[PDB]
A paper describes a structure:
According to the crystallographic structure, suramin binds to both protomers of the MjTX-I homodimeric structure making different contacts in each protomer, so we considered the binding events as non-identical. Comparison of the monomers of native MjTX-I and the monomers of the toxin complexed with suramin yielded an average RMSD lower than 0.8 Å, revealing that ligand binding did not affect the tertiary structure of the protein. However, a deeper analysis showed that there are important distortions in the residue configurations that compose the MDiS region. The distances between Cβ from the residues (Leu122 and Phe125) were between 8–9 Å for both monomers. Thus, according to this classification, both monomers of MjTX-I/suramin are in the non-canonical conformation and are thus unable to interact with membranes. The first one is related to the natural substitution Arg118Asp from the MDoS region of the MjTX-I. The second is related to the binding of the suramin molecule that hides several basic residues, particularly Arg34, Lys49, Lys53, Lys69, and Lys70, which are related to the putative-MDoS suggested in the previous section.
PLA2-like proteins are catalytically inactive proteins due to some natural amino acid substitutions, including Asp49Lys and Tyr28Asn, leading to Ca+2 coordination inability. Some of these regions comprise the myotoxic site (Lys20, Lys115 and Arg118) — subsequently called the membrane docking site (MDoS) — and the membrane disruption site (MDiS) composed of the conserved residues Leu121 and Phe12533.
Author numbering:
A (entry chain B), B (entry chain A): 1 to 13, 15 to 53, 57 to 61, 67 to 88, 90 to 123, 125 to 127, 129 to 133
Write the structure that this text describes.
């Protein structure tokens, strides 16, 4: 859920996940997918397609455990669905950190007027 | 939708809805419910119980029309679902305005600093 995902983003990027990625581009936050605007948007695109392959758990509400060892997200053993979900969340947190260099404040809202329909995952 | 809900909260409270309420307490913003920490937190708890009654529409995605008359939110006539959704969104904006005097900036973060399981809607 967002408790784990938002914490990972905070730990990797240092940014408020709700205010910085709650509605970034066409793919970051809620409101689904779309053709990505930038590298940051592409990370969230990757992420939501990771989520869609998961069907035995609920990424929105299911909780899971992980720990922070040597400043690295270490996913715990849960079951396979929850461990797969942990890995999706870890991947996007690292991705967003690596593309902070091109984060653009221009694209942080909720109407999505220019977002095109995304291709199938 | 999210657009109308955020616009209402801005019009009533004068605050940035995402920065001020995107993660306030246990019930404001971020998905999930819990024992409210104060009155502002309780406004969002009632709001999420309001949403759960609705099945014929999507609260997050479905747009509805409302108006601003005599500095008052006035819901348009929509269908019964969208009308009830507008009235839920209107009540949460008014409630947050009413309880601004006890707004506690110790409480606007998303990890759910640790909330107890909420009572049933």
């Amino acid at each position: 859920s967002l408790v784990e995902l938002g914490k990972m983003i905070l730990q990797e990027t240092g940014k408020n996940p709700v205010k910085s990625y709650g509605a970034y581009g066409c793919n970051c936050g809620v409101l689904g997918r779309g053709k990505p605007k930038d590298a940051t948007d592409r990370c969230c695109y990757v992420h939501k397609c990771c989520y869609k392959k998961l069907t035995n758990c609920n990424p929105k509400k299911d909780r899971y455990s992980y720990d922070w060892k040597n400043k690295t997200i270490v996913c715990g053993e849960e079951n396979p669905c929850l461990k797969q979900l942990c890995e999706c969340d870890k991947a996007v947190a690292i991705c967003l950190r690596e593309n902070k260099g091109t984060y653009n404040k221009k694209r942080d809202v909720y109407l999505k007027p220019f977002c095109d329909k995304g291709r199938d995952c």
